[PDB]
Every structure is written in C-alpha cells, then in structure tokens.
C-alpha cells in the first residue's frame, strides 16, 4: 500500500494508546484495499485527519512577565485593569509550575477595545491564535460536525480543523453571547 | 471479558444481567466499527460503570456529626443544630428518607459549604448540580440512544462517579 506507510511516517508524533490502536485498525481495514473509491476513502479521509490532528505538539509558552507586559503594551493603550488580570493570570500559572487553562471572560460597550486584546494576549504567551464567532450559530455541526458514515461530513471543523495549527495549546477566542 | 468482570463484582440485578447479556449477544452480531458499534459499546459501557449493589456505610452518631460539623465550618451554632436534630430523627426513624433540606438565606453565606460538611459527617459520597432555568428534563433523565447526542444525565453521571448507591446529591439555586 502506497499511503499507508506515508500515514504511518507522518504520526510519528507523540499518540496516545487509544489514538493509537483505532488507527492501526484503520490502517489495517484500509490494508486489505476494498475498493478505490469508496470504502477506500471514506476510511482514507478518517485517517488523514487522525494524523494531521497533532498529538502531544505544544508551543513553548512565553514565561517572562517583563516580556509579556512589554507586548501588551505594544499592542494596546493602556487598558490598565485588564493588563493586569492578564498578567497575574501568568503569574498564578507559573507559581503552580503548570497552567490551569481558565475562562476568561471580557464584558463592556462596543469598541472598546475587546476582541484586539485577545490577539494580544495570544502573541504574549506565545501561543497560537484562533477566532470563534458563535452568535448567530444555530446548528451543533460546526462545534462537533456529523458522523462519519454520512457523505460530506467535515471533522466538525471549528474545533478540529482548529487544531491543524500544529499545537495543542492555542488560545481560543469566543467572540459573543449572541 | 472486562465488562464480564466489572459486574462479577458487585451485586446485579435480574433484569439488568438478561439486558446486559442481550445487549452482548446483540454486539455478538458483530457490526464493527460503526455507528450501531459505538452505540453499543458505550451503552454497555454506562451499564457496567453504574454501581448496582455496592453502597457506601453510614455514620448517624450524633458526637462525629459535631466535630466534622464544627470543624468544617465557623459559626452557624443554630444551622449546626438543626443539622444534628435532623440527623437525631434520621437515626430514630432509620429511614433518614422523609423530608427534604433547603437552606436559604442571603448569597454568599455558605449555604452550598453545608452540604459538603454534611456528606462528611454522614460518611455518603457529595456530588452536586446546579438547577439555573435548565428548562429541560434531558439533564435529569437524558436523552434516548437515537439522537446523535446520547447522553445519560445527571444522575446516572453522579452514580457512575460516587461508585455508590446511597450518594448525597445536592441541589443547588431550586429558586
Ligand atoms: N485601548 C486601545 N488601544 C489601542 N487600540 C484600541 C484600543 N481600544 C480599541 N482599539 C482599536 O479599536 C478597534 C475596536 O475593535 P474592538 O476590539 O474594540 O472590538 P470589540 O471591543 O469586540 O467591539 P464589539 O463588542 O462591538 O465587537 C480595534 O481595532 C482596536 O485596535
Ligand atoms: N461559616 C463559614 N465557615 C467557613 N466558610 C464559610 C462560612 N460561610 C461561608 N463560607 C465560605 O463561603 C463560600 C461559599 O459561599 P456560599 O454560602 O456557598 O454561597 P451561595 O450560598 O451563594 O452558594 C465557601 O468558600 C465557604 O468557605
Ligand atoms: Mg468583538
């Protein structure tokens, strides 16, 4: 099989167990090679995303307080409160020597300066970026998408195709309560 | 088999073991890897993770219920008592099954720290769930296996969590 050892280089990634034995699964049901076109490739698809889903990538996170401070300020004028909710949310995390991951919630009129400060904030920790919008979201899908056995289904992509950042730590933005 | 182990040691019921069984030989007819496959594994999976017999031992003394009372929390000399007379009749009746608690008063009073002081002095697994306009039964009861979103609810969560059938379940914000 010719992309079956290509799959099998590319998740040379840290996987977990369990990750790791439903794709080998994987690989051996589309092994036998069926068909071409379609019980191939529904499984092929299946695969693919299994590995380009990155397992165990982190980003290095920014510790430096002066650093991040610096880049906040480079960012934005002077949103003093908040800046240092940001940076005491850093110091905690470092104190306790690994993060927390805590929800963050920013409230106030229009334009004033809500959604920038989140772009900030990510280029701070050095993490990477990422943008919900989910007022005006009426359907599930695009949180967790369709099961695979229908036809067009998308790995509910917002969240997973979010994760083709090759990181397992970005910083997520929910826009609205809309 | 594993789940055939998870229920060898604690206590089933009749009807559960034959529909856990039929369920299995329903798999049995091996479907791998779908739909109708998840479906049943995580159905049996719920199965053998609910507790069936296995309970947690109690403690009605009324000398333990005090200290843990009054180690956990200052103050509150008059909700102290009321506990341990609740915990008095309970001891009476033995049913410790009749009525109701409900603690109310302003926000920020601890009303929500008494029920895990009282899990402790009666020795029962704490578990807790908000009720804030939920408007819906699907987080008490859930959902059916149909909908692409099963899930078993609130209860059956905290019984597959305590590991015991005589959990403590508080309720938060009734009002
Ligand atoms: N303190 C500030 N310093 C520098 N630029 C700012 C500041 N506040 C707002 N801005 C700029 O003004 C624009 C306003 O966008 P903003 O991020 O405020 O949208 P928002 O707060 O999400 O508003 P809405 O809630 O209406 O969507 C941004 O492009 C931002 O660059
Ligand atoms: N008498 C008390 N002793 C110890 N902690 C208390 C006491 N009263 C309140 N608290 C604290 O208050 C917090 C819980 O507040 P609570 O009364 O549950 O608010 P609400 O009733 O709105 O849920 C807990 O962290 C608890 O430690
Ligand atoms: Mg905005």
Redesign the interface.
């Given at each position: 099989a010719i992309e079956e050892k290509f799959r099998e280089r590319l998740k040379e990634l840290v996987v977990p167990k369990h990750v790791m034995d439903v794709v080998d699964?994987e690989l051996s049901?589309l092994g036998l090679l069926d068909n071409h076109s379609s019980e191939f490739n529904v499984t092929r698809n299946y695969l693919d995303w299994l590995t380009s889903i990155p397992w165990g990538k982190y980003s290095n996170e920014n510790l430096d307080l002066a650093r991040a401070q610096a880049v906040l300020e480079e960012d934005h004028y002077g949103m003093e409160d908040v800046k240092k909710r940001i940076l005491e949310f850093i110091a905690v995390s470092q104190l306790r020597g690994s993060t927390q991951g805590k929800i963050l919630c920013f409230y106030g009129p229009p334009g004033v300066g809500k959604t920038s400060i989140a772009r900030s904030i990510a280029r701070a920790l050095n993490r990477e970026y990422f943008r919900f919008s989910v007022g005006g979201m009426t359907d599930?899908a695009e949180i967790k998408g369709?099961?695979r056995?229908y036809v067009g289904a998308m790995p509910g992509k917002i969240i997973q195709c979010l994760k083709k950042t090759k990181t397992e730590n970005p910083l997520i933005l929910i826009d609205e309560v809309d």
């Open positions: 699964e049901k599930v369709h099961r056995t």
